[PDB]
Structures are given as C-alpha cells and as structure tokens.
Amino acid sequence: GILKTKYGFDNLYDTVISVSTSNGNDINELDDPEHTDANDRVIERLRKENLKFDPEYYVSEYMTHKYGNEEDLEINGIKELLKFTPSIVKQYLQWYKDSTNPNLVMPIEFTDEEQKQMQDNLPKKSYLVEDIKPLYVTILSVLFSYVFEQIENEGTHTTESAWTMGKLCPQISFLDQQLKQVSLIKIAIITGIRRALSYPLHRNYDLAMKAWTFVYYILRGGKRLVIRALLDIHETFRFHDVYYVYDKVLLDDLTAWFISQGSENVIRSLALEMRKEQESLSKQDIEFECIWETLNIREMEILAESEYREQQ
C-alpha cells in the first residue's frame, strides 16, 4: 500500500496496469497493482481464490458430468469439450505418430502470418535476464491458460478469449510470478487447476487435467511449437483494446526473450518434470476454504453424491 513495486517481465514495468483499470481492465484482480509486493500478491491471490471458488457450482458441474442425461450433457457441453483436441496439439500428435524419430523436437515452419507477427509486433531488443526460472514458469502457466481457452472454445477465439487466458494465469490476473508463499512446478499446476475450478464457465477437474496434459505435449514438441502457442496468445491480447497492456508488460518481452534465448533442453526438462508432477496429483491435493473449514474437492463431490442419492 505504501511503496511501489514493479511488475511484469523481469519486474521492469509500472504505471500502466493502474491506468488500465480505469479504462476497463477487468482481468486485473489486484486491489492495488502498483503497491503490492511479490509475497503479498500471493497472499491476496490465495485469499481471493478461496472467496471466488463456488462449491455449489463445482459440484453441480460434477453431478451433471457424472449423472446427467443426454440433453443435460449436451447443454452443459462437458462431454464434447473433453473430446476436443486443439489444432496445435493435433499437429504435434500427428507428427509424433508418423515420425521416424519421435524423440526429436517437432520441425515447424512458421506461416507467413506468424513471420509477420514476429517482425511487426514484437520488441527488437536484446535481453540480459539474470533470473530466468520465473519466465519458464510463466510459460508453463500461460500455456495452460491458452490450452484451456482452446478447448473451451473448441478452437475458435472469441471476444472473451483474452479474459479466460488472463484469469487462468496468475502471472497476468495477479501479476504473480512467485506463486508460492514465503516444487514450484507442482504449485503452478495446482494453481492452474484451482483457478480453472473457480473462474471459467466450465469448472471441471477432468477438463483442467486434460489441459495440463496438452501443455505437456506442446512442451514435448519443443521450442518452435511453444513459439507457435505464444504467438497465438500474444495476438489474442494484442488486438483487444483494453487487454493489450498484458502484451506491453509481459507477453511482448516473454515472447521475444523466448525466441532469442529460450533453451530446447530447458523446455524438454520442463515437459518431463511437469508431467511427473501432474501424474503425482489427485483431487485430494486440490483444497479450498469453504464456509471456515478446508475441504478437498473429492470430499465435496462425495458429500453431494450422497445428497443426490437420498433425493433419488
């Protein structure tokens, strides 16, 4: 509250987020984006996630998925979403199936449009960044936000796409690259799940886990495939007349830095590490404070199933 703390890529930016909230930036979730230190952003985010989470919404989604009739499933959409494969994932999995050496990174020839985007829309500066770990974690988190949007919209962007991506990415909504109060990869995965169960239209653990599995595939595809995703994200924010501030303060530099300095070996290790962390998780790791008691989401489901069986 008293002093300024910078934010965004390499904590270089200020002013612009505060200005944007007077001009319709509803992605920002910090009460005081210019005067909240990194640890306080985590504390505020965790508090706000517990408040945002709606257990009744969550268990209604769960009950529809598991017990809904054909029409309720169709109206809700969950079954169709869980069958959808975004183009970027599909192109990787096709190449992986057909390759004589599937261990390698996926060859990617950038389209004319992607080339023009890189030439016309990204900063032309050199980068010297001391602390790259938070950047790779940002890539992990923002890929999840992107994949989730791609699934929920069945591959067609809408005017709400930037909001969905911004809300599922703590580095955007809360300018929070720290994530942990005080592994970081595990915390990033859990954070993505908690936010996917609290903010979007479809709030479903299987859907969130599907998105993380697809992030794993994108990372396994390698640097150029990750660039393809980052360019799509950048374009989504760039031509939204409120939300472009997130390109200014984070995604412009994240994308340009990654193109110039991103490591294939780091990306492959990140793919394998995040998959190991993801596979270690269960619903018992996903907890919320509810009206106060701490409950995991499986406990919530069981309690709801019991009430439904009694009503039947």
From Swiss-Prot:
Alphabetized UniProt keyword annotations: Nucleus
Self-association and partners: Interacts with CBF5, NAF1 and NHP2. The interaction with NAF1 and SHQ1 does not occur when NAF1 is associated with the chromatin.
Protein family membership: Belongs to the SHQ1 family.
Keyword Methyltransferase attached: no
A single MF term (Gene Ontology): unfolded protein binding
Record's subcellular location: Nucleus
Predominant cellular place of this UniProt entry's protein: nucleus
Domain of life: Eukaryota
Stretches of the chain forming a coiled coil according to its record: none
Protein name: Protein SHQ1
Further remarks about this protein from its record: Present with 7060 molecules/cell in log phase SD medium.
Function description: Involved in the early biogenesis steps of box H/ACA snoRNP assembly.
One Gene Ontology term from the biological process aspect of the record: box H/ACA snoRNP assembly
Gene Ontology cellular-component annotations: cytoplasm; cytosol; nucleoplasm; nucleus
